[PDB]
Amino acid sequence: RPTFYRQELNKTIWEVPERYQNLSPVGSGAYGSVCAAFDTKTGLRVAVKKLSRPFQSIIHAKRTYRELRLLKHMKHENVIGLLDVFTPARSLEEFNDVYLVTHLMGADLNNIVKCQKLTDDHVQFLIYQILRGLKYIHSADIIHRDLKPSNLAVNEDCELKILDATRWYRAPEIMLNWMHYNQTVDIWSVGCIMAELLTGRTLFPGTDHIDQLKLILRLVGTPGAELLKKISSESARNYIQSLTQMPKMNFANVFIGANPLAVDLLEKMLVLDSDKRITAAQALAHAYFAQYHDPDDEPVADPYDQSFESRDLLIDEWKSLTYDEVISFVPPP
Numbered sequence: 040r041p042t043f044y045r046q047e048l049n050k051t052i053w054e055v056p057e058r059y060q061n062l063s064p065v066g067s068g069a070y071g072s073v074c075a076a077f078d079t080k081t082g083l084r085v086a087v088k089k090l091s092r093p094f095q096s097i098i099h100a101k102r103t104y105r106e107l108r109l110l111k112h113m114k115h116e117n118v119i120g121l122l123d124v125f126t127p128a129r130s131l132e133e134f135n136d137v138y139l140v141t142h143l144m145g146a147d148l149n150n151i152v153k154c155q156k157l158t159d160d161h162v163q164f165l166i167y168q169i170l171r172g173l174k175y176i177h178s179a180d181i182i183h184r185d186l187k188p189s190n191l192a193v194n195e196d197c198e199l200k201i202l203d204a205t206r207w208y209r210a211p212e213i214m215l216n217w218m219h220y221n222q223t224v225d226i227w228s229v230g231c232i233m234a235e236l237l238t239g240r241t242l243f244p245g246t247d248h249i250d251q252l253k254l255i256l257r258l259v260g261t262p263g264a265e266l267l268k269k270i271s272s273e274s275a276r277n278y279i280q281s282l283t284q285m286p287k288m289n290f291a292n293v294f295i296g297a298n299p300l301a302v303d304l305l306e307k308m309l310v311l312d313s314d315k316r317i318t319a320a321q322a323l324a325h326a327y328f329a330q331y332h333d334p335d336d337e338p339v340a341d342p343y344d345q346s347f348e349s350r351d352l353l354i355d356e357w358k359s360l361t362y363d364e365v366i367s368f369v370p371p372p
């Protein structure tokens with residue numbers, strides 16, 4: 040129904056509704072390539088992502104369905120969402136390309152830090168938005184698992200969105216391949232991010248996988264008696280006992296000059312035991328965010344049906360389910 044036009048971008052033929060003008064490449068990768076554009080219907084600058092080989096295999100097809108289901112479900116100011124999704128195909132039989140459209144963001148978190156301290160007012164506002172979006176994501180029973188400055192976009196008014204080395208911000212239970220980690224692995228990442236904003240430097244800049252765990256234990260101490268009781272691995276538990284004990288450090292002496300409320304929040308985020316970590320909802324009520332907290336405007340998500348993750352289907356079945364989601368899409372107001 041919309042009039043499409045073809046154009047040569049990256050190494051391939053983009054077919055795109057005429058409402059999107061001035062297509063200009065921004066990136067590339069195994070799973071897709073992205074162009075910046077201008078949406079003449081809305082007047083917004085947008086990013087258009089063309090999925091790469093979306094139905095080449097069963098794995099690609101399930102990936103394409105997962106990515107579209109996820110981005111269609113996210114409707115929150117501090118999480119990336121869909122402005123549009125389209126295909127040049129007029130029927131399922133000729134359905135072979137998928138394009139996703141989102142609001143163009145000018146920079147990520149690295150771009151605003153630049154190895155410099157942010158003010159406490161600024162960190163308050165940025166971490167509040169991350170936690171606000173995290174509360175929404177976690178309420179849908181989703182775990183992000185890869186929170187880091189490059190996965191956090193910010194515009195010129197400092198409005199932040201969570202996007203779709205990484206080990207610097209990874210929770211220690213992931214580093215040790217524990218099977219049953221919970222949502223507070225993301226809270227660990229936010230603690231690492233917040234520390235970096237206040238100090239201007241990476242909190243745990245490990246040079247490899249084992250060095251990363253070494254730096255973490257030097258700050259938060261060796262596992263306590265109560266945490267060792269919950270470790271099922273006999274090899275892990277034995278190795279931990281053989282280590283020289285290290286005292287949990289006093290964050291107030293580590294982050295000198297910081298807001299004491301900021302230090303108290305970091306203490307509650309960077310706990311080794313993930314069962315004792317503050318949740319996103321609890322962190323929003325912390326006194327550190329007094330000037331931004333509003334419990335009437337920190338919404339949760341609708342329930343998100345993730346049962347498809349357990350399913351093994353054929354290429355054409357994932358493709359047809361993906362086609363259903365393209366057709367049923369409703370643009371936001």
Ligand SMILES: Nc1ccc2c(NCCc3cccs3)nc(-c3ccccc3)nc2c1
Nearest residue numbers: 086088139140141142143144190192202203
């Ligand atoms: N971790 C990242 C990093 C970059 C990203 C990026 N391109 C950078 C320019 C941006 C456009 C919109 C938000 S950010 N774009 C998209 C994306 C674009 C369109 C549809 C779905 C996703 N995700 C990103 C995830």
Ligand SMILES: Nc1ccc2c(NCCc3cccs3)nc(-c3ccccc3)nc2c1
Nearest residue numbers: 211212215217262269270271272275312313
């Ligand atoms: N209820 C909990 C809470 C936390 C846990 C945790 N956290 C990581 C603790 C350490 C991280 C680095 C050195 S010790 N790690 C493991 C675990 C680690 C290795 C093999 C099997 C399980 N279980 C946990 C269960």
